[PDB]
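User: Show me an example of a complex going from sequences to structure tokens.

Assistant: Sure. Here are the input components:
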Amino acid sequence: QPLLDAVLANIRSPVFNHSLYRTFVPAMMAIHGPPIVSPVVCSRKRRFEEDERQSIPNVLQGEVARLDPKFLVNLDPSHCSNNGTVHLICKLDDKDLPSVPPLELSVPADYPAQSPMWIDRQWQYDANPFLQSVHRCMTSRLLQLPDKHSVTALLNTWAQSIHQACL
Amino acid sequence: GVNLEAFSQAISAIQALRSSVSRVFDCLKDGMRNKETLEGREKAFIANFQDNLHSVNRDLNELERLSNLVGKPSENHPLHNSGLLSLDPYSQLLQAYKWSNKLQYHAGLASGLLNQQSLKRSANPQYVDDVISRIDRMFPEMSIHLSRPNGTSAMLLVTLGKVLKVIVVMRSLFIDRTIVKGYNTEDGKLDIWSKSSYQVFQKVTDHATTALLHYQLPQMPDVVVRSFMTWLRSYIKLFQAPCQRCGKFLQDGLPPTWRDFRTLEA
Amino acid sequence: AAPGAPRPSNSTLVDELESSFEACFASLVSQDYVNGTDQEEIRTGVDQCIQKFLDIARQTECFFLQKRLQLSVQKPDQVIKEDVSELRSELQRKDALVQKHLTKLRHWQQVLEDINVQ
Amino acid sequence: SPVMALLLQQFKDNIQDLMSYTKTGCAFNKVLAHFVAMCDTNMPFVGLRLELSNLEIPHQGVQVEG
Amino acid sequence: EVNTATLCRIGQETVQDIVYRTMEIFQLLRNMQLPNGVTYHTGTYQDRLTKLQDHLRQLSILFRKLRLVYDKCNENCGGMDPIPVEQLIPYERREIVEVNKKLKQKNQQLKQIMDQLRNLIWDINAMLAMRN
Amino acid sequence: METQLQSIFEEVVKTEIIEEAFPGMFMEDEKTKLISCLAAFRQFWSGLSQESHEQCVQWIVKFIHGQHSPKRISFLYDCLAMAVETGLLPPRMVCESLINSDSLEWERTQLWALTFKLVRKIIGGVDYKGVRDLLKAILEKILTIPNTVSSAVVQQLLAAREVIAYILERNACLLPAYFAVTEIRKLYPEGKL
């Protein structure tokens, strides 16, 4: 019903938003008397210094912290520092049979991709027939993985293919 | 007298109306702090009017209106004010009323949240039973009766609305061995054990046995039999089946969680 | 000093249980007038009191269990003596139940002979 | 409601006995129980993953430390 | 006469009983209506008053015993005081064992006796099934 | 037509389905099924107005950069390269269709690396003197990049320099280099750094 104040606020185009002060605050401070509605001091520096500057994007850090201790990830030659951010050089040190460490180079944390790249595979897989079967199984599983993810999905599929294709 | 809650709601509503008026007049006492693209904060002004539209919520009180218009001049309260002027110490009565109500609600909440018991275990009367049965019989549409034809145990029968009467044998408490029989009953000369049903009432008896084994408390059989009677009386409708259609199976009856729903749903 | 990360504090977990117990009871009785109006203001206090009570009871039970384990792994002779006492108590309870059942059976034999006497 | 025919050929029989010998271990409960409970505990999780794929990181299957 | 482990168990049972008595006093306070309500003028009123009086006296004695057993457990720190096996949890006695074996044998004998007794009881229940 | 063909190809290619992906025992198709899909696609588009096939070729790229699936992108690139090797799918058309409209400079660095490895493998693409034109577009993608991107994508993005160096070095046996000069003149007007 009181659209008059609405059309008046619409009229309030000029920059001098101080006439409303003299218009309203006299009666407001008269009938309401909280001159200090917040006498608590408020002086904090918003941005002094806050940055990691000493590691990779911590997203993959928090991800890899969840994985099973049977996966041992290390650091490769420095080519995945910030943008690529991942050189998944992992060892499956556990009670199961060991194998060749995967590469699994994923992309920036935006994740418009996954990890499996398999650079050093060309000679690591075709040499051993059993490892060749392992690679075949791992490829067939990865192709059936809809939009696999950085560390969890890739490493899980790799381990399950390695310990399923034993036969 | 739930009208007290309605009047409290009206008080909260009018206080919210006053607060909204104050807030909108205070917001009008300030401009665009930092917009830099458009003073869209003026739309919040319109939003503030919505809170002023909450004044129409106070108009909802007209539905809650006409709560009290009677005689009864303050319900037997005036003793010293309208009576002996020298009797000024009256308000002690109201103080005691408030104290008792506060204690009641406090202990109620305390017992309700004390379900997390901490006692591991306990290690280092037919007249009372009939009286408990008669006291439990005090609810409407729940005509029960007992006869004890055989044994010192209790033989109790219940008939609420239909011919679906149920018998429950008790041992002065924790009445086990339930048997429901829809439309016949006490054949021969006393209660029977036919337990015949339509493949659904037998399921109801299974549910009752499950509840008895479930609602069994370590002591205080009064609360036990009270929960039992409420759980049985909750079957007065048998006409709705949420979480599914009305025909999920032969019949959809299982209110173990204070609400009926479609059967075969655990 | 309280809002910070460090928090030096002692002299608790002994009488603090009784303190927390008596806490949510003075609101019921005190040498102050009690306002004749209340609506869910008591629940906000009783829930906190009850959860603190349960927490401190669990703390005390954990302390007792820790002392139990320490003295058990240190000196299991106490555990052996406790098991012996439990066995003695079980035997005594069994003997008492047997005596009561025998008394009941003898009484029933007597009344059965009396009933058969006709 | 027609049956959505998605067989998936998902079965291990009779190599389920191999999975049984891989672990420490007269009806055939030991295999049918596995084959029913795996789906019984998987379907809720795969449904949660499907509904949660909208927000972020719907990676499924990470066991609790094995 | 150390009875230290039994003492700790008694303290645990005592705090459990304190919690249960708190629950009980709350459950008995919630049902304390107005005196001149219908009929409970003073009889049940004064009855539950004396009941809660005994409750509080017993609870005070229990708090006394709790303080005493806590002081005893504190003073019990004699020899092997640190005992770091708490964080290091793992991952003659012949006469006592023989007495335990004899007790279990007597218990098995009494168990067979109770089995015969309950067999006779089931038989009597069967007879009553034939009753009129 | 083209829309139905793309729908059929997507329904055939998208064989990945995580149906009860729990660690159950529910029980190299990457080569035989790939050839089967390639043969089905060739038999479909063989009689589907091949005159506009090149347009549909660009439509193929619509599905190329759709999924992220780096292993699947590599597999798709390999199978389409093999299909080109069967005489069908002329290479110039498919490379021209794939290079543009999906460059995504640094947006898909993995897709960039795989696409450049593919075009390097298919850099044969024998045609008339109108081949170096594609090189122009390549340089365009190198132009939309300041050399201050990231220390990680250095050898990853180096596939561009690798393929261009291969092109210009094998120009002794690949294509006349003076045409390459007159093509790169579109980048520099006789000295432009």
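The lines above are the inputs; the final block is the predicted structure for all six components together. Residues 93-129 of chain E form the longest helix (37 residues).
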